[PDB]
Amino acid sequence: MKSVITTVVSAADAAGRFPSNSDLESIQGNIQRSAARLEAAEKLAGNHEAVVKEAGDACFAKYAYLKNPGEAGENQEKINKCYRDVDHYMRLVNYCLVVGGTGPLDEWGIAGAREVYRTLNLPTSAYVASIAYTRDRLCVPRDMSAQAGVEFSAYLDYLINALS
Amino acid sequence: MKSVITTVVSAADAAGRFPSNSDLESIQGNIQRSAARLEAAEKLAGNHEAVVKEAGDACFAKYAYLKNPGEAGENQEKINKCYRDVDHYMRLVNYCLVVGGTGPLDEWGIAGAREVYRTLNLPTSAYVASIAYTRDRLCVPRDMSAQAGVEFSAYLDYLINALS
Amino acid sequence: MKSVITTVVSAADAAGRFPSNSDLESIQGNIQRSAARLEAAEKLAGNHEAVVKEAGDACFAKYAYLKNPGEAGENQEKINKCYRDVDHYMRLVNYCLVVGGTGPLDEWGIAGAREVYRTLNLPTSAYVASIAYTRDRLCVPRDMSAQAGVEFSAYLDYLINALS
Amino acid sequence: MKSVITTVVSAADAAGRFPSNSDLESIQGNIQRSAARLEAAEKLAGNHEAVVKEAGDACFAKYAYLKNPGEAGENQEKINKCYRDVDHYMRLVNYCLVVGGTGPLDEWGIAGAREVYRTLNLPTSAYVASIAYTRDRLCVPRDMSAQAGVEFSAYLDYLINALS
Amino acid sequence: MKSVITTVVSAADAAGRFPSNSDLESIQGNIQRSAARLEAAEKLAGNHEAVVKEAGDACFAKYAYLKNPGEAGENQEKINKCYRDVDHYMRLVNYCLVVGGTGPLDEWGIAGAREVYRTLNLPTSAYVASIAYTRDRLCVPRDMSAQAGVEFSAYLDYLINALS
Amino acid sequence: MKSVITTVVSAADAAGRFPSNSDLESIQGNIQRSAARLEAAEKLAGNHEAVVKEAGDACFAKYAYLKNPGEAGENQEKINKCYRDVDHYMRLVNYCLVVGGTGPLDEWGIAGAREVYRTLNLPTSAYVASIAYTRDRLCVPRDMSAQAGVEFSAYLDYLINALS
Amino acid sequence: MLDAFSRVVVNSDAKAAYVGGSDLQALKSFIADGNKRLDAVNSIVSNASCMVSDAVSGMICENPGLISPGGNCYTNRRMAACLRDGEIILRYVSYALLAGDASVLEDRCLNGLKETYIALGVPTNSSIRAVSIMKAQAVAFITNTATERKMSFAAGDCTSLASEVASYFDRVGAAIS
Amino acid sequence: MLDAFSRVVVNSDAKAAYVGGSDLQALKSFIADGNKRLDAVNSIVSNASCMVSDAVSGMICENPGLISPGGNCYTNRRMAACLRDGEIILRYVSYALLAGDASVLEDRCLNGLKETYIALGVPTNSSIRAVSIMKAQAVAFITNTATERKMSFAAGDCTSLASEVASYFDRVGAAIS
Amino acid sequence: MLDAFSRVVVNSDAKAAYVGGSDLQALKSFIADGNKRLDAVNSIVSNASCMVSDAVSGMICENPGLISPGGNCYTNRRMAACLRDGEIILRYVSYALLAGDASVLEDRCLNGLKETYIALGVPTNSSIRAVSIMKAQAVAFITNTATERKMSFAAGDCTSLASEVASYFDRVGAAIS
Amino acid sequence: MLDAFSRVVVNSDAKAAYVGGSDLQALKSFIADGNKRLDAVNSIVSNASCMVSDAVSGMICENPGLISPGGNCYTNRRMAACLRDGEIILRYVSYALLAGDASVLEDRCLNGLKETYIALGVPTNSSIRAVSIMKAQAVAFITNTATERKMSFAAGDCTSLASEVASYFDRVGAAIS
Amino acid sequence: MLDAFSRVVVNSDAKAAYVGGSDLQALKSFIADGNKRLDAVNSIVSNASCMVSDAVSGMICENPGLISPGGNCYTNRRMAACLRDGEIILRYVSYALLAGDASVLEDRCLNGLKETYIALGVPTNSSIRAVSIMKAQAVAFITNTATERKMSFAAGDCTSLASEVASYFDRVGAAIS
Amino acid sequence: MLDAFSRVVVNSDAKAAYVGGSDLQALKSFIADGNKRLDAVNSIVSNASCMVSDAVSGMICENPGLISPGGNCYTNRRMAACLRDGEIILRYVSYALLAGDASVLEDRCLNGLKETYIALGVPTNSSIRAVSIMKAQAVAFITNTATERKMSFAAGDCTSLASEVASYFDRVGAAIS
């Protein structure tokens, strides 16, 4: 699981050498900025039951052709496991918020991205379009501060750049 | 460019050894079956201006949401380069017909498949759906024989299994 | 054990990929030509007790100096194990007839060719001269057909090109 | 030349991947702490002509046997190139101050440490003893602050741990 | 070109290290024994025109069947290049006498031994039989001493063990 | 453990080939010179209790500053394990005398030379100075012969060239 | 490796016997239905991603035990694992079917398979569910008894091929056991 | 490799001079706008696939010469090539921007670049089109003058960063020339 | 590998639960003393060669059994071995202390450690002496209770860090057992 | 690499044209004499060691200049060299004959051949003697005009194969020039 | 590795004792017959291919069990194996004889020898036949009691060398057992 | 490689002539002073670290141009370079002296030496200073005209060895030029 701190111990493995000041101020930035990070995640857990019904149903507003069999949403059980899919999507962006590093992105969303729903015959275009609703869907004086929401935006758009 | 014959000379490179009877009957099967292969490709060149208007417009019958910008078919110039795209699609299946091997599939359609329209923001679901129209769209007593049409089907479905 | 069919599954291992039409007509040549192969081997088993007394004794007509000790044929037990040697020689050319591939040549006559009777102090010049009697010793209207006897010739002369 | 920033671009080479937040707060620590680093180096250049006459002459107070030939300090030209040696010693600790990373330590003082004066017949025990005078020879309310002098101590004692 | 001395400099390359007493007595044995080696080679040059007419014609006494074409000695020009062949045979054993090491054996008689006259259709059995005449054909009180003739025997029988 | 004889069997491993006359006179030099080697080692065992009190105490005459703690000879138990150190020093030069090769030098004094007392904070300058007393401290008409004492000198000065 | 054309040699030279007109009736009637095997195996390459998608989706249908959080196989890295861990053995049973011989699995992909999977901690009940339902779907897919995936063939009997593929499937099903 | 914090050392020890209060006014005013550089570079990682998609699609807009059949770059293997051949240098100019120094391109990705591309036969006019339109889009993208991609910042002047990224772009534009 | 910021995720997704305001009081009070951990760990990198020199010299102090001739560890090749065999685990316990997590030893350096050391024939009583006296010296060295090595800190309580490093030390002390 | 079945594709996509019923009369009449090519090439594998033995022995017949002492090729290491330096190109012209295409020599074995041979100091007059007499013997050996090596064929015309092998031989004969 | 000049050191430092005038009478009388060992070992290198040819031909003389079809060692690949599997240990017993010490076999070629041969399925009765008849021929070959291979020596007693080579032969004969 | 015992063969077979009693007076008088060469070369291995220390210290004596800051060779990495770049050619001229032949330098260490050093930017005037003062010290060191390093020899004439080592030194001195 990659963090910042995991990268510099593996940098000290790649050196095979001692912890110098490569380490000793990356953590002090987390004294400022991970303290400035954590406050979003309570409404991220607080909106987690309701961001699904805007985003996935706006992808139904995007993609509504799904009645025909041989396609993805031919029954409503497929639709409530779409809800189950995107449930763990913002649950994982809750996770790569609180670690900082892209490990829960990489090994847990991106390891198995480029081929999986290709073979499972599902497009990632809705997987990027629901999160494309949540691009600027944030309010930096009003939802939370301007000190972590653009980073929260950077979290789930590195996700989409990985998905694209 | 992979053929059957290319694989067995590289097998004779991987052996570093002489052409034995690993070679000497793979060509004799082409005396039967490549003679039983070539006859489709004249109507494949003969239908090449008309298989596009069934298949790509049936993918417009599949995917018709494209009016909004930020999506793929927001102008008609995108639609006639869809026509230009699938033009070279059945032109390449004309090519991997007449070689037999999957070289013009692999290095010329599959080298650059899994990521290219991912980054170019286009789904391969229509790229498989137009050819999913052309699955059983063939007539083995009536279009051509039953001795190459199932192989022609096998050509462009190995294409889709590669695309999926 | 190398055959034609073994080479193309290992070609599909070297690809790591699916059986395409690299395979699918090498077997159809065996529908023609292995059916045109099998008919020699009954008189090859039928002459197997008598091809030894022509070929090895013609190599005694070639090489008759063997009375002196420190040489190869200094007793008659060496001479009847010469008979035992060439027994398995045409038994192995019966084997690489019916597989087609050179596996029973390679791993079973050629793996251990260049050094073995070098260290066992025996020349391969008689090992090639007895089979050099059996070069054109065949009759393509009369012994068997002209469709497999030249291939039978090609079998045991690839053997000698391997021995030389 | 290793810095912190050099390690994370080579971490992004070892990933072969994009600059995430592995990078993006290691630099912000340099906004605090490299601003809290630079202020020592003017008196380090200001004392650079006088730290030699305390430290190297205290190593003469340590090691004064050097009159005999076949040893190191048998003439005074050896003694003023001792002065020339330690000149570049605190000049290099001025350098690995202002980069932060241990590159000017490693490739420029440690690459060629364990064997060089071994073959040049000089002990590193005086090379560690002069800097062992400069261990606690610092004043954190009085020379400079308590925010970089212990790090300055950590700089030239990682040097000695490398020398030992 | 391998000698004893070449092996120990390459041993000092394989060590990458200094000439110790691995070297320093292998040469002193050549002070004794290469001085005890050189005295044969003048009659080896002195008999060089006459050892051919005993040995190669005793191989004609061994192998006299050569009148038939498709074999080796079908004309007398083949017979005088047999003389030219064995000329350089005892010329090379003159050479690996005076170096001691097996370099002029290995790279100059053995590099290209196992396959060369195999493909050139010539047996090495006469190549070993002429030298098998010269096994005990030596006289240790009478031709030369007993201090180098057994080593001379060891020279050209390592040759035959290499040829076998 | 490297000897001369070990190097030529590993030369016959690096050849993968037979013992020729690369071997067969390196041993005959040991018939002369290892017989001319062994006679020193009885007084080397005979002086072994007294060469320590000249050499290590002359290194105390060299290096007498050791009263201060944080240095090496701050107690007399350090001084009698200096005696224990150099005990095994001339015991190992007794060993690389009687093998000839530098194996008991290399793997048993030099494997772990350049860094060991560096990290254990001890100079090798006294380790070379005590043996620098024993440079010409020998008597070639008078202690032993002139046929092995310069080689004995070469033994323990290759030791110092390794130590430097 | 080995073939049905090769294990007739390995028992022949185990006896030093002939290969010839004693097993030959099986040999020409092997290649009499070679086009029948080709009629089988292009149906197998048609929906291989649908084969492995049906296999993994039915595995979540009557088992929620893998997708339990903190379970065995509940991560997309591990669904990419039984992407691979299904598809490459589907490749290998296609290799056994094209060889006509079961000599290309236990040497090839089951070189101590389940011992490494127990070292990975893979529960065997999930595995035997996976190979069973892929067995039943593959015998449904060699014939033309799909939903509407009705490819064109020459009609007749082909149940020897069903006994062929099931023999490879309980060979792998026992060797994963 | 090297940095703006490092080339101040390499000219200092080229003189055996100090590093200290002579370049220090550039040094503290380097890190005064470090948050401004962070305000720049997260806009760069936002639409990197859109950056390379805009670059390659404009390259087919006013050049059809690559997509000519039998041309240079008309295969999807070669559009996957300038997928890579655009994106990894976008990674590298992001590396030069985070270092604040141009020491991570010509040693890193242009170790004899265009000589190998002429050995690949790549025409330079396509390359200079690619780096110029990616230059103009990247200076459009460090500021908030997009279509509607209006991220939130603290407002003010940031044109020193525009002179920064353009300097890296004609460094690569000359070294590909 | 893993971290204290990561094992809060691995038990969260073991429950499919949140990470958030239930462990958060440990989380902000983790990073409240991050400078305190930095105040600890630069004392650890100060005398690492003195740490391993003290460890090996005390091992010859009350054990002469290794330095017995024909013993286990009586050669300078083997004192170079427990040069390494001490220093790289000192590196690794520094890695566990900077991670704040014990996930970087048994996967990293104790992948079957003592089984290989019994294959090397290393006696365990020497090992438990080595890790114990390095444990007692490391808890003496995280605080400022040295001989005169009195570095400057901000004063106060830091015994949470002593319970931290001792937990890593009996984790390695049990896993070498 | 490439084939006669492949260079019909490389000029087709050089035009973006069809492959089909314009070169097809050459295509079916290529495979009409495929058994004729097989009737040729098993005569070539029959006496390959006799081919290279005839080539090198005729090279000493009307040239004694190589076997001059202190000459170019007068050592058995160098006769083992033109053992190889004949036989592997005999392998390669067999590869060009089985491909029906000259695309497997200059990319394969003549990647700067004679420049390296001039760096080895090989005189070209020996080389052109070698390839010419092996050319004349190979056109004698594809037909049944040997001494008594009279293999059985179906009789008729096969001089298109003679024009085939001679085209490969002056392609290598010019590219060694 | 080790020598007779080395195991006198390994027991000396096992006692911390001298090497000197206690084993010295064995030491000078070791090198007194060093020319006698050289008189032995050049007879061993004289007919090494005859040694291994005699060994394998006698193994087919009173054993036809290996050359049984479908037996253990009935293929020329396996006679090339006991070409090697005889000759390299003949090299190794020559190495033990030139060292004067048995320290170069079980570390060198018998590092778990027969366990790997049972993994190869080699029957031990063939092996003990091979090493015993090569033992009896090697003690016949160190002396001048051959057929007529009568090399010249200085005459006298050399049975110490016969006890030497037989000790190496039952050391390998027990360690293959 | 080659030797003085080998280049007498390479001109002999350049003529197809004998080696024997025409160069033999040089041959026995080569090995008559082989102990004289051994008397030379153990003086060379005595102070090799003193040889290279004298060479590099005199190079800083009358040249301060390398140790100029920002000069060529002013770093300890580059003094470790001409540690190597002196010592390994001292090894190589020891190899030429033990071979008695200059065939082990230009093939061995000067395979395009100075072209790579100009690619490294090494100034040749430093190099010719280095090889000249090491030449003058090595001819001082083969004889017993040191400071007090007075080894014991048998007295007499040995100036043939001085002409030997100087010939190797201007061979390397010209080939570095």
PDB file of C-alpha atoms in Angstrom, chain C residues 84-141:
ATOM      1  CA  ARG C  84      21.525 -55.169 -32.533  1.00  0.00           C
ATOM      2  CA  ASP C  85      22.637 -51.567 -33.198  1.00  0.00           C
ATOM      3  CA  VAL C  86      21.211 -51.250 -36.672  1.00  0.00           C
ATOM      4  CA  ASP C  87      18.045 -53.129 -35.541  1.00  0.00           C
ATOM      5  CA  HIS C  88      17.096 -50.103 -33.508  1.00  0.00           C
ATOM      6  CA  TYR C  89      18.321 -47.840 -36.331  1.00  0.00           C
ATOM      7  CA  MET C  90      15.559 -48.853 -38.731  1.00  0.00           C
ATOM      8  CA  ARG C  91      13.233 -49.238 -35.777  1.00  0.00           C
ATOM      9  CA  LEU C  92      13.756 -45.571 -35.029  1.00  0.00           C
ATOM     10  CA  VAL C  93      13.220 -44.614 -38.669  1.00  0.00           C
ATOM     11  CA  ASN C  94       9.965 -46.560 -38.366  1.00  0.00           C
ATOM     12  CA  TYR C  95       9.215 -44.295 -35.431  1.00  0.00           C
ATOM     13  CA  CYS C  96      10.028 -40.962 -37.075  1.00  0.00           C
ATOM     14  CA  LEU C  97       8.035 -42.101 -40.037  1.00  0.00           C
ATOM     15  CA  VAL C  98       4.857 -42.436 -38.042  1.00  0.00           C
ATOM     16  CA  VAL C  99       5.218 -39.272 -36.018  1.00  0.00           C
ATOM     17  CA  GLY C 100       6.411 -37.101 -38.928  1.00  0.00           C
ATOM     18  CA  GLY C 101       8.391 -34.707 -36.733  1.00  0.00           C
ATOM     19  CA  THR C 102      12.063 -35.142 -35.984  1.00  0.00           C
ATOM     20  CA  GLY C 103      11.675 -35.747 -32.232  1.00  0.00           C
ATOM     21  CA  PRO C 104      12.568 -39.448 -32.338  1.00  0.00           C
ATOM     22  CA  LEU C 105      15.386 -38.416 -34.594  1.00  0.00           C
ATOM     23  CA  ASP C 106      16.561 -35.522 -32.395  1.00  0.00           C
ATOM     24  CA  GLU C 107      16.219 -36.569 -28.764  1.00  0.00           C
ATOM     25  CA  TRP C 108      16.488 -40.279 -29.509  1.00  0.00           C
ATOM     26  CA  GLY C 109      19.198 -40.575 -32.154  1.00  0.00           C
ATOM     27  CA  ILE C 110      20.909 -37.190 -32.336  1.00  0.00           C
ATOM     28  CA  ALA C 111      20.987 -36.308 -28.649  1.00  0.00           C
ATOM     29  CA  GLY C 112      24.157 -38.237 -28.107  1.00  0.00           C
ATOM     30  CA  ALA C 113      25.509 -38.482 -31.636  1.00  0.00           C
ATOM     31  CA  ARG C 114      28.614 -36.309 -32.080  1.00  0.00           C
ATOM     32  CA  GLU C 115      30.682 -37.636 -29.182  1.00  0.00           C
ATOM     33  CA  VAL C 116      29.303 -40.954 -28.058  1.00  0.00           C
ATOM     34  CA  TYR C 117      31.067 -43.395 -30.386  1.00  0.00           C
ATOM     35  CA  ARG C 118      33.903 -40.922 -30.526  1.00  0.00           C
ATOM     36  CA  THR C 119      34.517 -41.794 -26.884  1.00  0.00           C
ATOM     37  CA  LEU C 120      33.378 -45.358 -27.545  1.00  0.00           C
ATOM     38  CA  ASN C 121      35.983 -45.417 -30.388  1.00  0.00           C
ATOM     39  CA  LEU C 122      33.611 -46.325 -33.177  1.00  0.00           C
ATOM     40  CA  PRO C 123      33.336 -44.576 -36.552  1.00  0.00           C
ATOM     41  CA  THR C 124      30.051 -43.230 -37.828  1.00  0.00           C
ATOM     42  CA  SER C 125      31.348 -43.706 -41.375  1.00  0.00           C
ATOM     43  CA  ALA C 126      29.889 -47.213 -41.437  1.00  0.00           C
ATOM     44  CA  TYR C 127      26.797 -45.788 -39.720  1.00  0.00           C
ATOM     45  CA  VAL C 128      26.402 -43.545 -42.731  1.00  0.00           C
ATOM     46  CA  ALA C 129      27.598 -46.082 -45.340  1.00  0.00           C
ATOM     47  CA  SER C 130      24.963 -48.750 -44.612  1.00  0.00           C
ATOM     48  CA  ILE C 131      22.276 -46.121 -44.946  1.00  0.00           C
ATOM     49  CA  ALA C 132      24.145 -44.869 -48.042  1.00  0.00           C
ATOM     50  CA  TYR C 133      23.368 -48.277 -49.485  1.00  0.00           C
ATOM     51  CA  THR C 134      19.729 -47.598 -48.649  1.00  0.00           C
ATOM     52  CA  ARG C 135      19.743 -44.195 -50.456  1.00  0.00           C
ATOM     53  CA  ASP C 136      18.180 -45.123 -53.764  1.00  0.00           C
ATOM     54  CA  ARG C 137      17.569 -48.689 -52.609  1.00  0.00           C
ATOM     55  CA  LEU C 138      13.783 -48.273 -52.991  1.00  0.00           C
ATOM     56  CA  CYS C 139      11.405 -48.716 -55.920  1.00  0.00           C
ATOM     57  CA  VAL C 140       8.701 -46.059 -56.396  1.00  0.00           C
ATOM     58  CA  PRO C 141       6.494 -47.989 -58.904  1.00  0.00           C
TER      59      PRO C 141
END
